[PDB]
Amino acid sequence: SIGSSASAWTDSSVSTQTSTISRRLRLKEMATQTEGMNFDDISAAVLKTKIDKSTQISPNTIPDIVTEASEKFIPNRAYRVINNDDVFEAGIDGKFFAYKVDTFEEIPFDVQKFADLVTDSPVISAIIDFKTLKNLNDNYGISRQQAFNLLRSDPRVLREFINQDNPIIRNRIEQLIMQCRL
Amino acid sequence: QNYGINLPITGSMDIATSTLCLYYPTEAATEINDNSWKDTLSQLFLTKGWPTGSVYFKEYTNIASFSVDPQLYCDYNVVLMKYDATLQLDMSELADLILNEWLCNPMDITLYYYQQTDEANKWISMGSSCTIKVCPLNTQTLGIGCLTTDATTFEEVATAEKLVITDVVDGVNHKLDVTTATCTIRNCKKLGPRENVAVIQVGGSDILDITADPTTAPQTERMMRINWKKWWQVFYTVVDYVDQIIQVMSKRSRSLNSAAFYYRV
Amino acid sequence: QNYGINLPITGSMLTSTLCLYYPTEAATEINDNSWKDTLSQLFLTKGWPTGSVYFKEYTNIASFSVDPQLYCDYNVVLMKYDATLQLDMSELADLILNEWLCNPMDITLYYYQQTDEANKWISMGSSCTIKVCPLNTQTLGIGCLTTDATTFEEVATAEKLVITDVVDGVNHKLDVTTATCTIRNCKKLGPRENVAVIQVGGSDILDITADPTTAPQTERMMRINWKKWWQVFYTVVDYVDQIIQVMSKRSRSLNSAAFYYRV
Amino acid sequence: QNYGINLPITGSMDIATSTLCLYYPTEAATEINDNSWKDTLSQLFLTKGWPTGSVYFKEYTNIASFSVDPQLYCDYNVVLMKYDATLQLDMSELADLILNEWLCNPMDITLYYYQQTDEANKWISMGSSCTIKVCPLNTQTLGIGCLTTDATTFEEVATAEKLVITDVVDGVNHKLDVTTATCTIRNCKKLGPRENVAVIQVGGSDILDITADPTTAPQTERMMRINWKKWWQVFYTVVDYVDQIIQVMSKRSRSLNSAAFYYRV
Amino acid sequence: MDVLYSLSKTLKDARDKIVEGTLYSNVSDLIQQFNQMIITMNGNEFQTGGIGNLPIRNWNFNFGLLGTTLLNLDANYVETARNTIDYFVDFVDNVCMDEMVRESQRNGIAPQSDSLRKLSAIKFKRINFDNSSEYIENWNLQNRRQRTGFTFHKPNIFPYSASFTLNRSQPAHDNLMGTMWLNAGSEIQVAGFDYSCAINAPANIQQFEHIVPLRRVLTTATITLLPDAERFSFPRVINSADGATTWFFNPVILRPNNVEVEFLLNGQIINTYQARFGTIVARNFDTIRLSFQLMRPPNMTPAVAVLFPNAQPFEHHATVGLTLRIESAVCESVLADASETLLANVTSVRQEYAIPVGPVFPPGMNWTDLITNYSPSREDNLQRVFTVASIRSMLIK
Amino acid sequence: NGQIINTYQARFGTIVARNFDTIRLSFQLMRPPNMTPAVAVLFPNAQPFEHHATVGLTLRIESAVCESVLADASETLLANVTSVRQEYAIPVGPVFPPGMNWTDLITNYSPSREDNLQRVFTVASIRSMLIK
Amino acid sequence: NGQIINTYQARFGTIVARNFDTIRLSFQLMRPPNMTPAVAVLFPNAQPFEHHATVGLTLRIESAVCESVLADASETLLANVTSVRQEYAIPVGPVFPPGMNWTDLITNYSPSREDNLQRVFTVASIRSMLIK
């Protein structure tokens, strides 16, 4: 297979294989093996808010909306894993990148080690992917704690950035939110 | 976007439920001698892996009547024809008519004078009473074994046959005379292999020829034969091997979403 | 497979058939049989090979609507205005003017509903008369009862061709004399650009879309005026250049039929 | 000096009373039921800005009689035609005859054999009794659905119509037969848009076609429609908006001082 | 090579400073330089030309010196110096004219002309006034394996190639979805057009992308990203790709939604900008990838609602457009510019005497083909010829 | 002098001309041979028209060298001349057009006006070296 | 640069090309004019086919000289680099692709990667002169 040996998760060619790996890894969100916030939390929150605001839905209609929303929401998911000061990230759409936590230097991609480690290791939803992170590290003078928590997607620092109303984080959040539709 | 302009494809070499109709003759219905057999066969197909209510069944009175413009409205079709020791040419015509795509242009019998261009061109006539009489012509439109004004010296090629396929030598015009009130002749050009259907023969001795070409006798894998004495055995056999039958065939290439200006009928 | 249809493509900066549908009225009025030879020879002089032009006859607009059978690649059809037949005229023009994909319906037993604006119910036959009753989630008729048939609501009576629409989204129970008609559920895919309609007298009645607020006039729906059919024939033949420039030829039907069947 | 040799013009892009005739049908005169109405309308036009005695008025007995060589002798003309639900082709012919410049050359029916050259060529026949019968010919002057010596097998194209426009397919000659004692046929070639006139229709349903071209249905701005029940309302409406009517039109381009060898009639 | 630049600069400085009446104590340096140049130059002949119509000329050198006897320059001393100077100027001009035309496939960074090759000998190495000028300094620094640069204004680097790529296409062109772009000079304008106007599009949003490579790495690029492109905003009728039919284009310009501009290097992300218009700064990039989204108006008005019929009949297609301009940039290799006439000098000298096309430069010095398939040998030869051209343009104004 | 020096056919992009004083442009509008419904209708062979056909070329010179003094939009000379002139509301001179309207000056370009322009621009360039 | 330098027609065997960067191959499959029973039947003009026709060319370069550093199967450099790299399980560098997968390195051949390859191969060649 693509990993080190046979396992139930290793079963543009690099892009396609990584996309399949990410699509299968999407199910990890039901495995309680995540750190911090995750995509499904945002989906549930927006579903609750739009249920409360809406009034044109009958009690016979809730199951269909919930079933469709739990699946179709956020097709563009990203995941990143950490190994010895190195970070590998892969996207469902076909994006794949690797970078270091010190100065965010571009790192050549190795599929083998990614498949080796993602099988049994912490996984964190990549709300802040590499594009936003690099733009933030360039255009804004953040400290090491903020960046390290962002790679972990700590709610406190993310909400502090929201308070500061940084245009890049607003753009990322709004792009994520606009995708929430049937 | 727009289809039809076939942009060249480039792949690689590093990679690892629909409608199903079925026809049968009336003799099969009489031999079955049952009412709820349709439900039984549908449930058997459900067991084999098809949805219930997705397997229709039709019927034809006779091989003759089935020949009158044989339509098909299925994504997967298998036609059962009962062999008869005297209608060999009729069976060959039926197979060659329902086995290949036919692209037709209407042809008159009174004003124009029709001819043929290439070996991939044929004449198909269907009707209740088809009597086809032909006469070759020269460059000066004079008489060659038949006079244009006369009509009683034209050579018969097929009389009273419910299906008539005919072909004349390329490079010469020919005049026609046929009852338009009972038969219709259409100028048709053969496109290629129509994979939407298969033919299963009961009894028989490998009679069908799918082309007028002498030197070739292509025994297609879609042409398959069995033997029978009670129709229920044949029905069970054809139901049992559904996987092989569907694997042999494929989707009707002319019915996919690539239809746009692909010379679809 | 794909030469460039819907897939990336890079640019830079004779034997074709021609049919002609004519009503019996023209032939009866002109009262001749040699006119076919005259028209063929005129076409030859214009530059089209002889015998490449077909001619077909229809007794009436109602009869011609019964399962139309296209017989060429390019097509021009003629129709005459009627005092109280504009519905059939427009419906026939729309039907033979756009491509259709129809799923056969077992109307007798089950129920049906459409799915979107691009869905319609098409019915043809010798004598068709449809009656429908809308349903609810309780399976009881609205303004009707599910058992009796007389108390239903008329949509069409004794009509040869019916093109109808309902409130798309809710099931409905229909009824018809099936032994004298046929009903098929169809979806309008796109423009069938190999057929044009020429009006002979009238005031541009045709509408090719069930949308009430949109009713365009394309390049294949024109009008002329007549006093002797020979004038119409001569004008049509002389200006064949414009007509052949208007339509395309890549819309050939994969088989001789008006609308495809379950594809 | 001399005109006609069009020397190219060069401008820049840095810059900031005549005769008016009017026609009406007899039914309008009967419905008016007055004597001094002409003076009233002339004074109204004086109020709107035209000199008195500069607005003539004429009359035509019927749409049929108005069709007999419709002359015009005005620098500004508006023609009022009463719509009728059965003379649609007559109205179309009248509009297409009085709306475009027509350049004609006389044509015989006995000695020569006339034909057509381009799509901008037409045949116009006017007379008290116009019966037009035509017959196409081949290269060898043989018979094609009609014999030259015979005259009872020619196809009618228009009978007893006071106005007749006809066109035949380019590239073939045609022989004629028409009563010269009651009708006149003139070979004419269409020049272009004659802006000296406009057409206003009462009632109607947008029937007029200004060309034999099928694929085009040009609704000119000069073709305008109204609705009526009493003629006085229509007269008041057309008088009120004189400014718009004259602004739509323009001077007769073929009547300016540029006439010299500009192919004026 | 540096010998020629030293000669040209010394001649220009001498023509600048030796004017009537000036005090000698201000041209002592140039007097010593000129005397050394005359001492080393004499006794060695030269030959130039021999190819095409270029005039073959022979050269001699027998001149006096410029002594130190006066306190202020008089007319006669200036006249003598000027008479010598003009002759040396003609010598430099003819040597350059010989050098510019020729080329070589191999060793395309070394001198080729006989006069220049003889000049490169060691016994002439005593004349190098300075290397202050931009091109000569860059050449000298490139001689010793060091990073270089060039201050360029409107540095045309995009080859001219008008092209479009369709995405959805009817056979008769009644339902089109695709992109039109035109890369002229240093100006990129990309337009994304749709016929459906996002009425049948998935999620009512149509995705557009376009990637344009660049053969040479730039730096310090001030990028003016202005929306509402002008190259495709007017009616058009063009031939199809196969050249057997045509199509129409009736455009309406909408608001480009969520404009994404990305600059990459070596296959990684360097600098990104979302939804910013105006002027932005990029520091190091080799590939430009512009992508955005066309958004259907969520609500309309009578005219707008009529203008976008949901059904197939279409008479008004929608399009969004962007404009990419490079108003300033610094490159690592020689390129065409607009602040001088260097490429103009090369083209004029090539065409004036009709040298037959060699094995490197495509005929006529058409910049499109020259920049199309960029190869290091071609770049080196162009660098040498441009250095010689800049030498010429620093003598004749 | 009416003689052809530099010629280029279908060379869109960047071209160079060595020495010229007259520009002659010729292009041909050709009706497309084969059509499609839209263009097949929008160009009728009859009289009335809804859309006219036109082709166009944009020619821009980016850099040049002249043997005589000329103004440019890439320097600060003509602005200096007009600013100094309007500084004290001098009456219009007997040579230069009023207010240094550049179009009026370049219209009837006279050798005397050329010499005066050369002197004025040289003096302006001398002045521009100091006031920074 | 899209310009023809070396061309050879029907020269099978050994040919030499002096300086090239792009290879264009064109060949034509022609139906034989006259036939014999076997080939006369095995190529039917009808639809069904039992054997397809194909032609093919094998082009192999045996020796070449390049102006930049390139690996080869006739020396022992890339093997030295990969052996030294995997000797101590070094984390993948920010330039070279993982594990010196030669295809991955040659895919996006960058000038920086070229310079790094040159330095590494030079150092390896220095090392190979001693350990015998």
Numbering used by the authors:
A (entry chain C): 583 to 593, 606 to 776
B (entry chain O), D (entry chain O): 51 to 66, 78 to 326
C (entry chain N): 51 to 63, 77 to 326
E (entry chain n): 1 to 397
F (entry chain o), G (entry chain o): 266 to 397
Reproduce, without paraphrasing, sentences from the article in which this PDB structure was first reported.
Rotavirus, a non-turreted member of the Reoviridae, has a triple-layered capsid that is assembled stepwise in two separate compartments in the infected cell: the virus-induced viroplasm and the endoplasmic reticulum (ER). The icosahedral inner layer of the virus, composed of 120 copies of VP2, is in direct contact with the dsRNA genome and encloses 11 copies of the viral polymerase VP1 and a similar but undetermined number of copies of the capping enzyme VP3.2 The intermediate layer consists of 260 homotrimers of VP6 arranged in a T = 13 lattice on the surface of the inner layer. The outermost protein layer consists of 260 trimers of the glycosylated protein VP7, with the inter-subunit interfaces stabilized by Ca2+ ions 2,3 and 60 trimers of VP4 forming spikes which mediate virus attachment and entry. VP4 is a homotrimer of three chains (A–C) associated in an unusual asymmetric arrangement in the infection competent TLP form.
The ER was extensively reorganized, characterized by gross dilation of the lumen, which contained clusters of TLPs. From the three-dimensional tomograms (STAR Methods) particles were extracted for the completed TLP (n = 279), eDLP (n = 138), DLP (n = 42), and the SLP (n = 28). Each particle type was subjected to subtomogram refinement and averaging within the Warp-Relion-M framework while imposing icosahedral symmetry, resulting in reconstructions at estimated resolutions of 6.9 Å (TLP), 7.7 Å (eDLP), 12.0 Å (DLP), and 26.9 Å (SLP). To improve the resolution, deviations from the icosahedral geometry were permitted by enforcing only 5-fold symmetry, at the icosahedral 5-fold axes, applied to the appropriate asymmetric portion of the capsid. This produced global resolutions of 4.2 Å (TLP), 7.2 Å (eDLP), and 10.2 Å (DLP). Lastly, we find that the structure of the non-infectious intracellular rotavirus TLP differs from the fully infectious mature virion.
